[PDB]
Amino acid sequence: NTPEHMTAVVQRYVAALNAGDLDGIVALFADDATVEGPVGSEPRSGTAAIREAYANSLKLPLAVELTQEVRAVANEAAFAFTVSFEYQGRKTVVAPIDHFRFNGAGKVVSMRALFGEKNIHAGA
Amino acid sequence: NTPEHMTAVVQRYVAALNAGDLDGIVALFADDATVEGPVGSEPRSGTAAIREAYANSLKLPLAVELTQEVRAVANEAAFAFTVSFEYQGRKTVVAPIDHFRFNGAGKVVSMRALFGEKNIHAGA
Ligand SMILES: C[C@]12CCc3c(ccc4cc(O)ccc34)[C@@H]1CCC2=O
Ligand SMILES: C[C@]12CCc3c(ccc4cc(O)ccc34)[C@@H]1CCC2=O
């Protein structure tokens, strides 16, 4: 469980969101992992709940892009990125910072997505 | 304790590091706050320990800059930035992502600085 590996996992995650690859996303998580997004809302725990959450997230085609280098140290990674989508002619860009914590096996045991209304950038 | 306030606190923090303003930094924290930087190392707790930690951080003049919008939601903020300094003719730029959690009073109760060796950018 190295910085190289954690950075790679972040890149796999971004790419799988772009591809709508739900298996690929869920495969990154430990069986008892938790996901909390946005920070503040009630977390989802376990493979089944995690899959359901990302299924709802992938209803629309997402364009996802890392916007800076990944920060990876010890057993944690943080990264800045954008998620862009379009609905009823409005394009929206959401710019979160995510935090992953990894277990010794290199699977994500916790994901937290930090973004507020000021990080949601959309026209009329 | 609003996103506006948390964003302002982040901006006050960045500016106080630039100014070497140790009082200004410590004033942002709750009396029993913790600081952990880099993530992984042993955290420091309490006003006295927090001041000592930032005193050591301010031995050299720091140039600190937010490099993206702050992410602020509920009681937490995350931000991407750089800390630049020079020593013995070598310029170094460190690019962390910090996470703050706030108490109801609007003081920082926990700070975590996430950066690894790949986020330390220095010449020979
Ligand atoms: C962008 C988004 C809010 C956050 C978000 C979405 C999808 C995948 C995400 C993946 C993340 O790691 C962090 C945040 C999101 C939603 C899809 C529609 C929407 O409003
Ligand atoms: C940049 C640095 C490592 C991280 C760091 C420093 C100083 C203030 C910081 C403030 C932060 O919120 C996060 C990280 C740092 C150090 C000064 C010298 C050095 O190597």
mmCIF file of N, CA and C in Angstrom, chain A residues 3 36 38-40 67-82 95-100 112-121, chain B residues 3 36 38-40 67-82 95-100 112-121:
data_model
loop_
_atom_site.group_PDB
_atom_site.id
_atom_site.type_symbol
_atom_site.label_atom_id
_atom_site.label_comp_id
_atom_site.label_asym_id
_atom_site.label_seq_id
_atom_site.Cartn_x
_atom_site.Cartn_y
_atom_site.Cartn_z
ATOM 1 N N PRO A 3 2.209 5.142 -1.894
ATOM 2 C CA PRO A 3 1.692 6.326 -2.597
ATOM 3 C C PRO A 3 1.440 6.073 -4.078
ATOM 4 N N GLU A 36 -19.249 8.554 2.010
ATOM 5 C CA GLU A 36 -19.980 9.703 2.535
ATOM 6 C C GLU A 36 -19.798 10.858 1.564
ATOM 7 N N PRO A 38 -22.294 14.222 -0.167
ATOM 8 C CA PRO A 38 -21.232 15.128 0.297
ATOM 9 C C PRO A 38 -20.932 14.877 1.764
ATOM 10 N N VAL A 39 -19.788 15.355 2.251
ATOM 11 C CA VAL A 39 -19.545 15.312 3.685
ATOM 12 C C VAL A 39 -20.727 15.962 4.386
ATOM 13 N N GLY A 40 -21.158 15.353 5.488
ATOM 14 C CA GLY A 40 -22.310 15.834 6.220
ATOM 15 C C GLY A 40 -23.487 14.884 6.123
ATOM 16 N N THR A 67 -7.758 17.690 -11.530
ATOM 17 C CA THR A 67 -7.315 19.039 -11.842
ATOM 18 C C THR A 67 -6.008 19.405 -11.153
ATOM 19 N N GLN A 68 -5.497 18.530 -10.293
ATOM 20 C CA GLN A 68 -4.171 18.700 -9.716
ATOM 21 C C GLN A 68 -3.593 17.326 -9.417
ATOM 22 N N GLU A 69 -2.318 17.315 -9.033
ATOM 23 C CA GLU A 69 -1.678 16.090 -8.579
ATOM 24 C C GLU A 69 -2.434 15.499 -7.393
ATOM 25 N N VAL A 70 -2.410 14.172 -7.296
ATOM 26 C CA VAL A 70 -2.944 13.497 -6.119
ATOM 27 C C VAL A 70 -2.001 13.705 -4.942
ATOM 28 N N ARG A 71 -2.574 13.887 -3.757
ATOM 29 C CA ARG A 71 -1.826 13.876 -2.499
ATOM 30 C C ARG A 71 -2.014 12.518 -1.830
ATOM 31 N N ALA A 72 -0.920 11.781 -1.648
ATOM 32 C CA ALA A 72 -0.978 10.421 -1.125
ATOM 33 C C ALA A 72 0.145 10.206 -0.119
ATOM 34 N N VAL A 73 -0.214 9.758 1.082
ATOM 35 C CA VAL A 73 0.756 9.560 2.154
ATOM 36 C C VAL A 73 0.187 8.533 3.120
ATOM 37 N N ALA A 74 1.080 7.768 3.750
ATOM 38 C CA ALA A 74 0.691 6.732 4.698
ATOM 39 C C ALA A 74 -0.372 5.819 4.089
ATOM 40 N N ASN A 75 -1.617 5.924 4.562
ATOM 41 C CA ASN A 75 -2.724 5.110 4.067
ATOM 42 C C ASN A 75 -3.876 5.968 3.547
ATOM 43 N N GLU A 76 -3.591 7.184 3.073
ATOM 44 C CA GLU A 76 -4.660 8.100 2.682
ATOM 45 C C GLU A 76 -4.286 8.837 1.407
ATOM 46 N N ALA A 77 -5.314 9.276 0.684
ATOM 47 C CA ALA A 77 -5.138 10.070 -0.520
ATOM 48 C C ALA A 77 -6.214 11.138 -0.552
ATOM 49 N N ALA A 78 -5.856 12.303 -1.068
ATOM 50 C CA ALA A 78 -6.815 13.365 -1.320
ATOM 51 C C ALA A 78 -6.568 13.893 -2.723
ATOM 52 N N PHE A 79 -7.642 14.308 -3.395
ATOM 53 C CA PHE A 79 -7.483 14.784 -4.757
ATOM 54 C C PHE A 79 -8.574 15.784 -5.105
ATOM 55 N N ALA A 80 -8.190 16.757 -5.925
ATOM 56 C CA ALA A 80 -9.072 17.788 -6.449
ATOM 57 C C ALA A 80 -9.428 17.425 -7.883
ATOM 58 N N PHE A 81 -10.689 17.615 -8.248
ATOM 59 C CA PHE A 81 -11.144 17.179 -9.563
ATOM 60 C C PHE A 81 -12.454 17.889 -9.884
ATOM 61 N N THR A 82 -12.974 17.633 -11.093
ATOM 62 C CA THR A 82 -14.285 18.130 -11.481
ATOM 63 C C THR A 82 -15.121 16.979 -12.021
ATOM 64 N N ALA A 95 -16.910 20.684 -8.371
ATOM 65 C CA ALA A 95 -15.471 20.640 -8.114
ATOM 66 C C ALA A 95 -15.243 20.212 -6.671
ATOM 67 N N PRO A 96 -15.244 18.910 -6.389
ATOM 68 C CA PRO A 96 -15.016 18.448 -5.021
ATOM 69 C C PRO A 96 -13.535 18.258 -4.711
ATOM 70 N N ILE A 97 -13.269 18.004 -3.434
ATOM 71 C CA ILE A 97 -12.043 17.364 -2.988
ATOM 72 C C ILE A 97 -12.460 16.090 -2.280
ATOM 73 N N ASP A 98 -11.953 14.957 -2.759
ATOM 74 C CA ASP A 98 -12.241 13.664 -2.168
ATOM 75 C C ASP A 98 -11.098 13.240 -1.261
ATOM 76 N N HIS A 99 -11.442 12.457 -0.243
ATOM 77 C CA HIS A 99 -10.470 11.818 0.640
ATOM 78 C C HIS A 99 -10.744 10.321 0.660
ATOM 79 N N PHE A 100 -9.716 9.521 0.364
ATOM 80 C CA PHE A 100 -9.763 8.070 0.496
ATOM 81 C C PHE A 100 -8.844 7.639 1.628
ATOM 82 N N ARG A 112 -14.753 10.036 1.325
ATOM 83 C CA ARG A 112 -15.524 11.213 1.687
ATOM 84 C C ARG A 112 -15.354 12.260 0.594
ATOM 85 N N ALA A 113 -16.467 12.831 0.143
ATOM 86 C CA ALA A 113 -16.473 13.819 -0.926
ATOM 87 C C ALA A 113 -16.880 15.155 -0.337
ATOM 88 N N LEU A 114 -15.975 16.131 -0.392
ATOM 89 C CA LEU A 114 -16.197 17.433 0.216
ATOM 90 C C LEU A 114 -16.491 18.444 -0.889
ATOM 91 N N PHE A 115 -17.734 18.917 -0.934
ATOM 92 C CA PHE A 115 -18.101 20.002 -1.828
ATOM 93 C C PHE A 115 -19.364 20.655 -1.289
ATOM 94 N N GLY A 116 -19.452 21.970 -1.459
ATOM 95 C CA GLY A 116 -20.623 22.716 -1.039
ATOM 96 C C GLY A 116 -21.245 23.445 -2.211
ATOM 97 N N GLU A 117 -22.240 24.293 -1.945
ATOM 98 C CA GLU A 117 -22.936 24.967 -3.036
ATOM 99 C C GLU A 117 -21.995 25.858 -3.838
ATOM 100 N N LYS A 118 -20.994 26.457 -3.186
ATOM 101 C CA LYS A 118 -20.042 27.310 -3.889
ATOM 102 C C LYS A 118 -19.131 26.529 -4.823
ATOM 103 N N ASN A 119 -19.104 25.201 -4.712
ATOM 104 C CA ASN A 119 -18.322 24.350 -5.594
ATOM 105 C C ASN A 119 -19.174 23.736 -6.697
ATOM 106 N N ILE A 120 -20.413 24.185 -6.840
ATOM 107 C CA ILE A 120 -21.291 23.754 -7.920
ATOM 108 C C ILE A 120 -21.416 24.936 -8.866
ATOM 109 N N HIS A 121 -20.909 24.774 -10.081
ATOM 110 C CA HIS A 121 -20.785 25.861 -11.047
ATOM 111 C C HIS A 121 -21.664 25.554 -12.248
ATOM 112 N N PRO B 3 -20.387 28.030 5.310
ATOM 113 C CA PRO B 3 -19.338 27.915 4.285
ATOM 114 C C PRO B 3 -18.566 29.211 4.077
ATOM 115 N N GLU B 36 -2.426 17.587 12.773
ATOM 116 C CA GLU B 36 -1.712 16.406 12.301
ATOM 117 C C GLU B 36 -1.168 16.708 10.914
ATOM 118 N N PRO B 38 2.596 15.893 8.525
ATOM 119 C CA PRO B 38 1.710 15.341 7.488
ATOM 120 C C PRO B 38 0.773 14.311 8.093
ATOM 121 N N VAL B 39 -0.305 13.967 7.388
ATOM 122 C CA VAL B 39 -1.125 12.851 7.830
ATOM 123 C C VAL B 39 -0.219 11.645 8.026
ATOM 124 N N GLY B 40 -0.459 10.905 9.106
ATOM 125 C CA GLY B 40 0.365 9.764 9.442
ATOM 126 C C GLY B 40 1.186 9.999 10.693
ATOM 127 N N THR B 67 -4.450 27.481 -4.456
ATOM 128 C CA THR B 67 -4.358 27.206 -5.881
ATOM 129 C C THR B 67 -5.691 26.790 -6.488
ATOM 130 N N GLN B 68 -6.720 26.624 -5.664
ATOM 131 C CA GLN B 68 -8.073 26.399 -6.154
ATOM 132 C C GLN B 68 -9.055 26.960 -5.138
ATOM 133 N N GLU B 69 -10.329 26.973 -5.525
ATOM 134 C CA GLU B 69 -11.392 27.349 -4.605
ATOM 135 C C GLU B 69 -11.380 26.445 -3.376
ATOM 136 N N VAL B 70 -11.783 27.010 -2.239
ATOM 137 C CA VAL B 70 -11.981 26.212 -1.036
ATOM 138 C C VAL B 70 -13.240 25.369 -1.186
ATOM 139 N N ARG B 71 -13.188 24.141 -0.680
ATOM 140 C CA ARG B 71 -14.366 23.286 -0.538
ATOM 141 C C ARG B 71 -14.831 23.332 0.915
ATOM 142 N N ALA B 72 -16.050 23.817 1.141
ATOM 143 C CA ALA B 72 -16.568 24.019 2.489
ATOM 144 C C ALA B 72 -18.022 23.570 2.557
ATOM 145 N N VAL B 73 -18.325 22.688 3.507
ATOM 146 C CA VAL B 73 -19.668 22.135 3.647
ATOM 147 C C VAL B 73 -19.839 21.675 5.087
ATOM 148 N N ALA B 74 -21.077 21.747 5.578
ATOM 149 C CA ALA B 74 -21.400 21.352 6.944
ATOM 150 C C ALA B 74 -20.454 22.028 7.935
ATOM 151 N N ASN B 75 -19.539 21.261 8.533
ATOM 152 C CA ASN B 75 -18.577 21.782 9.500
ATOM 153 C C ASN B 75 -17.135 21.508 9.078
ATOM 154 N N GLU B 76 -16.873 21.391 7.773
ATOM 155 C CA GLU B 76 -15.542 21.002 7.314
ATOM 156 C C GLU B 76 -15.147 21.811 6.089
ATOM 157 N N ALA B 77 -13.837 21.940 5.894
ATOM 158 C CA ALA B 77 -13.284 22.610 4.730
ATOM 159 C C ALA B 77 -12.057 21.845 4.272
ATOM 160 N N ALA B 78 -11.854 21.808 2.965
ATOM 161 C CA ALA B 78 -10.639 21.260 2.386
ATOM 162 C C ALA B 78 -10.135 22.243 1.345
ATOM 163 N N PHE B 79 -8.812 22.329 1.206
ATOM 164 C CA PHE B 79 -8.260 23.282 0.260
ATOM 165 C C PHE B 79 -6.906 22.810 -0.246
ATOM 166 N N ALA B 80 -6.648 23.126 -1.511
ATOM 167 C CA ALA B 80 -5.396 22.841 -2.192
ATOM 168 C C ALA B 80 -4.581 24.125 -2.248
ATOM 169 N N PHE B 81 -3.281 24.014 -2.011
ATOM 170 C CA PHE B 81 -2.449 25.208 -1.922
ATOM 171 C C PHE B 81 -0.990 24.797 -2.085
ATOM 172 N N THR B 82 -0.100 25.799 -2.081
ATOM 173 C CA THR B 82 1.333 25.547 -2.088
ATOM 174 C C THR B 82 1.991 26.338 -0.968
ATOM 175 N N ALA B 95 2.984 21.034 -2.033
ATOM 176 C CA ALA B 95 1.612 21.211 -2.505
ATOM 177 C C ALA B 95 0.701 20.268 -1.730
ATOM 178 N N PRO B 96 0.249 20.659 -0.540
ATOM 179 C CA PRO B 96 -0.639 19.795 0.236
ATOM 180 C C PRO B 96 -2.108 20.009 -0.112
ATOM 181 N N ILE B 97 -2.937 19.130 0.442
ATOM 182 C CA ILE B 97 -4.357 19.382 0.625
ATOM 183 C C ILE B 97 -4.617 19.296 2.116
ATOM 184 N N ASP B 98 -5.151 20.373 2.684
ATOM 185 C CA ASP B 98 -5.479 20.427 4.096
ATOM 186 C C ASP B 98 -6.962 20.167 4.295
ATOM 187 N N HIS B 99 -7.288 19.604 5.455
ATOM 188 C CA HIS B 99 -8.668 19.423 5.897
ATOM 189 C C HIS B 99 -8.824 20.056 7.272
ATOM 190 N N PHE B 100 -9.802 20.955 7.409
ATOM 191 C CA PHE B 100 -10.190 21.532 8.690
ATOM 192 C C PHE B 100 -11.574 21.029 9.070
ATOM 193 N N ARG B 112 -5.679 18.605 9.417
ATOM 194 C CA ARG B 112 -4.854 17.535 8.880
ATOM 195 C C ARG B 112 -4.277 17.989 7.546
ATOM 196 N N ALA B 113 -2.972 17.806 7.372
ATOM 197 C CA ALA B 113 -2.266 18.223 6.168
ATOM 198 C C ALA B 113 -1.813 16.980 5.428
ATOM 199 N N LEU B 114 -2.328 16.790 4.214
ATOM 200 C CA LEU B 114 -2.052 15.595 3.432
ATOM 201 C C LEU B 114 -1.075 15.957 2.317
ATOM 202 N N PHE B 115 0.150 15.446 2.422
ATOM 203 C CA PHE B 115 1.121 15.577 1.350
ATOM 204 C C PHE B 115 2.166 14.486 1.520
ATOM 205 N N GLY B 116 2.653 13.972 0.396
ATOM 206 C CA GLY B 116 3.691 12.959 0.407
ATOM 207 C C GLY B 116 4.909 13.428 -0.358
ATOM 208 N N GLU B 117 5.884 12.540 -0.560
ATOM 209 C CA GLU B 117 7.118 12.950 -1.220
ATOM 210 C C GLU B 117 6.862 13.434 -2.643
ATOM 211 N N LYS B 118 5.872 12.857 -3.331
ATOM 212 C CA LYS B 118 5.555 13.280 -4.691
ATOM 213 C C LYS B 118 4.948 14.673 -4.747
ATOM 214 N N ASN B 119 4.537 15.228 -3.607
ATOM 215 C CA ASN B 119 4.003 16.578 -3.531
ATOM 216 C C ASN B 119 5.047 17.578 -3.053
ATOM 217 N N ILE B 120 6.302 17.162 -2.964
ATOM 218 C CA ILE B 120 7.407 18.048 -2.619
ATOM 219 C C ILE B 120 8.215 18.239 -3.892
ATOM 220 N N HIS B 121 8.238 19.465 -4.397
ATOM 221 C CA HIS B 121 8.811 19.781 -5.701
ATOM 222 C C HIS B 121 9.999 20.708 -5.503
#
